[PDB]
Design a binder for these strands. Structure first.
Length: 293
RNA sequence: GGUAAGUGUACUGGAAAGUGCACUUGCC
């Protein structure tokens, strides 16, 4: 539940500029409380604004706008996590993948406790081209915490280079655009808020299943300041770990003295592609959870 | 020594913050 509100008509209006030209668009907004952005979206001449809101306190104020803008704002009382936007718009709007993005957009100012699990849920959806991505390469404009925004957009060798960097950037073009200060919200939180734009890639930079990249990225990054080989080890049961780790790094041409923050997405394609071949040869390797064995 | 803030720093795929460490400022 949200307890810090963005109501500056200057900042909500600037968020919807960064989403692009929406002048006949079908927009799905997830966050809206006081509808600050909601008002900003409707003044952009969208075709429809679909809006989901769990908190009932905000729905009378959203109806306030479904009448000041008749035939423009569809309201839904619901949970953005259970809600299926795959069926919220017509099949006529579905563009192919190797086309341009569709006329469907996601804009969102969720609580960070909702938006952080959800961006990963949506990243898996991009992988499977289902979910919000039945329409094609649906773009999304979301608010994360200043720090989380930088991790999604971080390049190699930087300090915010985390798991979220690779899980996002291999599937999406990611632009951390600007950062609103906490003082602009009401009441003020003890954090700053970043704004990030996602555009799904026609060809992902790793073509492996999402759960496979997940596992490689999770193990590379689990020991954070150390040699990246400290983490890649744990993909392999102890009995084969010495030989399977050396074979992994050598075939992928990875320097084991590299740190997790130093590995390009190219390095992950090589690690993932070779790890994919190891699981094809040993059908019971992929399930090795080192945490107990 | 115990404690609580603040600052810096490290980490977080469950970040409107949290935790470790260092220093500073107060207190017991």
């Amino acid at each position: 539940l949200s307890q810090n509100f963005l109501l500056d008509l200057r900042l909500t209006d600037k968020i919807v500029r960064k989403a692009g030209n929406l002048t006949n668009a079908y927009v799905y907004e997830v966050g809206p409380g006081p509808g600050g952005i909601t008002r900003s979206i409707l003044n952009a001449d969208v075709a429809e604004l679909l809006v989901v809101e769990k908190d009932t306190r905000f729905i009378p104020g959203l109806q306030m706008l479904s009448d000041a803008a008749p035939g423009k704002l569809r309201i839904v009382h619901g949970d953005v996590l259970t809600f299926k936007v795959e069926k919220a718009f017509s099949e006529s709007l579905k563009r192919p993948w190797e086309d341009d993005p569709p006329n469907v957009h996601i804009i969102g100012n969720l609580p960070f406790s909702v938006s952080t699990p959800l961006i990963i849920k949506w990243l898996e959806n991009i992988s499977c081209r289902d979910g919000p991505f039945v329409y094609g390469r649906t773009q999304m404009t979301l608010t994360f915490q200043k720090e989380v925004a930088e991790r999604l957009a971080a390049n190699t060798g930087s300090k915010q280079r985390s798991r979220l960097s690779v899980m996002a950037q291999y599937l999406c073009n990611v632009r951390h655009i600007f950062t609103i200060p906490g003082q602009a919200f009401v009441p003020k939180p003890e954090v700053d808020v970043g704004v990030v734009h996602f555009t799904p890639l026609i060809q992902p930079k790793i073509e492996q299943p999402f759960k496979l990249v997940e596992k490689v990225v999770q193990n590379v990054f689990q020991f954070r300041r150390k040699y990246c080989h400290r983490g890649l080890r744990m993909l392999f049961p102890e009995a084969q770990r010495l030989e399977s780790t050396g074979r992994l790094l050598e075939l992928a041409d990875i320097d084991p003295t590299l740190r997790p923050r130093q590995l390009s997405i190219s390095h992950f394609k090589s690690l993932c592609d070779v790890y994919r071949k190891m699981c094809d040869e040993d059908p019971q390797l992929f399930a090795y959870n080192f945490r107990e064995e």
